[PDB]
Design an enzyme around this catalytic site. Structure first.
Site, PDB file in Angstrom:
ATOM      1  N   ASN A   8       0.831  -1.194   0.000  1.00  0.00           N
ATOM      2  CA  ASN A   8       0.000   0.000   0.000  1.00  0.00           C
ATOM      3  C   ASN A   8       0.865   1.242   0.000  1.00  0.00           C
ATOM      4  O   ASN A   8       1.473   1.574   1.015  1.00  0.00           O
ATOM      5  CB  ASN A   8      -0.929   0.027   1.210  1.00  0.00           C
ATOM      6  CG  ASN A   8      -2.025   1.071   1.079  1.00  0.00           C
ATOM      7  OD1 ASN A   8      -2.597   1.248   0.014  1.00  0.00           O
ATOM      8  ND2 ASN A   8      -2.322   1.763   2.165  1.00  0.00           N
ATOM      9  N   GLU A  22     -12.472   4.588   6.467  1.00  0.00           N
ATOM     10  CA  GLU A  22     -13.776   3.955   6.121  1.00  0.00           C
ATOM     11  C   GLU A  22     -14.453   3.531   7.398  1.00  0.00           C
ATOM     12  O   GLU A  22     -15.627   3.818   7.630  1.00  0.00           O
ATOM     13  CB  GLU A  22     -13.671   2.677   5.273  1.00  0.00           C
ATOM     14  CG  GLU A  22     -13.938   2.817   3.765  1.00  0.00           C
ATOM     15  CD  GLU A  22     -12.675   2.623   2.915  1.00  0.00           C
ATOM     16  OE1 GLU A  22     -11.877   1.739   3.257  1.00  0.00           O
ATOM     17  OE2 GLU A  22     -12.471   3.342   1.910  1.00  0.00           O
TER      18      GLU A  22
END
Ligand code: TPS
Ligand code: TPS
Lengths: 256, 256
Positions: free
Chosen positions: B22, B103
């Site tokens: 990532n 999120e």
């Protein structure tokens, strides 16, 4: 009917400045704590709205919500979100949001429609939104800036009614200035900002356009902020890297 | 009916490993280019799915889509998104997504419902989703891990039908391990992963549960990857910091 005995001394004017810090990239829960100690210990005498945008990452927003107390600072959410995400934000008394390039660009190329939707969904739940627009370096080199910039704000505007602009801030931040050390010249910034305002003046209202704040973002630091702020159409700064340093205070002072 | 002349040599087993990078936080369009030069120049002989998650930020995803060619690498979107965002992703032939903590946490506190919705919207458009779950340090210290972890995956699962799991990867990444240098011990990782799998086995199916990959994430590097991968229930790694270094190759090798 409210001047002095003598003309001037300026043609502006100028809505209240914003000085926004985006802490999207920092893994130092400790130094951040210290930063906001600095921010709190800091006397800002003029009318400026300061914004801090923490990540959830590390200490971040939890630390900030707790430890930041300065009266001229609000906290903004980064991106956001779902309708649940907004409902959640309200619950925690967060009332500002930063939207822009991630949103326009996250999904492999110019999704302005998403930016527009998000800005409007946010304004509709009562948020102050800082909306970012900017060209890429390619679009700049090829003289596509004016077209791109107008395309972006036209999109945001399409989903808004005249009265929503009360809650809208525009950040002009060219993508080639973000994290690159290549800041816009005061002349570039002024140009783009002026363009944007002329667009808002014509398409939304001159009333709205003069009250609108357009911030400059992209490699703003202690050195360049003043000269930048001097510009007729610059109303402050969206600051990434230098916002994570004591010099952010100087960026704030430049906004006077 | 397909063993050798002699027992063993192991009780596993083990679905195909993933090794995910990532790159959410990196401003070096140049060194990234070099990294993926390294990745391409790299012979990975065993069955492992490598994932790279670039940001739009700087070169990033544009550079990666162009310059990364290795057959065992796919590119994933970070977060995402709107229905437009998914439609956009498809257009550019991106078929994997990483969802999780931003999120769950972006909006000031545990919005698992958003994670669930996003995972399902994504699976529904045909994406492979890497879904992250993890406790905070507070929840860990107070022995709330098992409850929190199960709460999170229960949420994701609620929106899915048995067959969707074919497209789901789980990343167990405790928030106290992200960017902190405090990686889980192999024993911690194994424990949590085992918990998760037992949950999936019971609530979804043993069939599904053995095919499911659960990656460990949080301060994985060249040193600790092997011992971690050795664990019965670890199927690879979600890697942030060390994914931006030549040692990512070693993290990949550890996955054999
Ligand atoms: C939703 C959303 N997420 C992230 C961004 C990007 N971003 C926001 S603040 C900052 C300014 C300083 O960069 P510098 O390090 O040069 O001061 C940048 C370029 C956006 N426009 N919209
Ligand atoms: C949508 C979404 N955005 C971001 C994240 C966070 N994140 C994803 S990759 C990585 C692993 C390595 O950290 P390290 O630097 O320790 O290797 C972290 C902690 C998430 N879970 N979901």
């Amino acid at each position: 009917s409210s001047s002095g005995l003598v003309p001037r001394g300026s043609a502006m004017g100028k809505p209240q400045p914003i000085a926004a810090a985006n802490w999207k990239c920092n893994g130092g829960g400790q130094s951040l704590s210290e930063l906001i100690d600095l921010f709190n210990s800091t006397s800002i005498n003029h009318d400026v709205q300061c914004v801090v945008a923490p990540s959830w990452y590390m200490g971040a927003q939890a630390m900030t919500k707790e430890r930041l107390s300065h009266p001229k600072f609000v906290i903004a959410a980064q991106n956001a979100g779902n309708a649940d995400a907004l409902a959640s934000l309200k619950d925690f008394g967060i009332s500002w949001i930063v939207l822009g390039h991630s949103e326009r660009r996250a999904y492999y190329g110019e999704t302005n429609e998403i930016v527009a939707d998000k800005v409007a969904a946010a304004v509709a739940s009562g948020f102050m939104v800082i909306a970012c627009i900017g060209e890429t370096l390619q679009e700049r080199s090829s003289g596509r800036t004016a077209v791109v910039v107008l395309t972006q704000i036209t999109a945001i505007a399409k989903k808004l009614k005249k009265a929503d602009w009360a809650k809208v801030v525009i950040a002009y931040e060219p993508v080639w200035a973000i994290g690159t050390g290549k800041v816009a010249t005061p002349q570039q910034a002024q140009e783009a900002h002026a363009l944007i305002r002329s667009w808002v003046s014509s398409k939304v209202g001159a009333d709205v356009a003069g009250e609108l704040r357009i911030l400059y973002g992209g490699s703003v630091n202690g050195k360049n902020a003043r000269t930048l702020y001097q510009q007729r159409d610059v109303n402050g700064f969206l600051v990434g890297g230098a916002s994570l340093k004591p010099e952010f205070v100087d960026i704030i002072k430049a906004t006077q």
